[PDB]
Point group: C2
Chain length 136, copies 2
């Protein structure tokens, strides 16, 4: 059987579709940051890292890259000088919108070999397996 | 729904169980190397990397680590001087055997929230999804 092998395949297959149907340039974590900042403009970097579940070094790297692409701006907080506020640029908003449409299409294509009834089973079974393993 | 999120969870859950039920020291790729060398003692490093699907740098790192733990030996090929033959030590064989038993138990526990009929569905659905995505 080999369910460890199968789980890695499933995750890799999703990563492959992200790269072919969403973007070869914007990664999933980068998009999550744009997404968090659409919902909460001006959120500080530390909190943005928390929203998307990234450590301080990875969020620093993501923010630097999005900054260099002109997709977000970073301002030192006027009040607390040792936090930085992040805000999307006009182009960052545009990129977030375009990618969102592609992501929705991509995930529909990912699940498309399954009939609607099977997709619900797919989620149920995988959730039960992941939940039980993480519950020890 | 978010199937990309779910796929990463499933893979992470398996990685968590490997670490708690198999070994915190021997990784999955390291075990795959021991496993390949039980089946084919004396296989060269390049081919071992091919059997387990690792690039030349990752296999080099795995082999160095297993070597330092006294689990495998490396000999320059008498014929072709620029290939290296790998062979498990007595302890490498013992570790492979003990881990194998743990891996079998771990994978049974991983799939255990599912009834036998559901486990077959779990494999069928995930394979269909991964196969279709990798077929573009």
């Amino acid at each position: 059987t080999h369910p460890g092998h199968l789980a890695r395949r499933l995750q890799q297959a999703h990563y492959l579709l992200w790269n072919t149907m969403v973007s070869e340039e914007t990664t999933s974590p980068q998009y999550a940051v744009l997404n968090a900042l659409v919902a909460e403009p001006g959120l500080d970097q530390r909190t943005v890292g928390e929203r998307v579940g990234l450590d301080r070094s990875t969020i620093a790297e993501v923010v630097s890259r999005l900054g260099r692409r002109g997709l977000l701006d970073k301002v030192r907080d006027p009040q607390d000088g040792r936090r930085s506020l992040l805000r999307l640029t006009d182009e960052g908003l545009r990129v977030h919108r375009r990618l969102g449409v592609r992501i929705a299409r991509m995930n529909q294509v990912f699940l498309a070999p399954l009939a609607a009834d099977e997709q619900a089973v797919f989620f149920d079974l995988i959730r039960r397996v992941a939940d039980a393993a993480e519950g020890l």
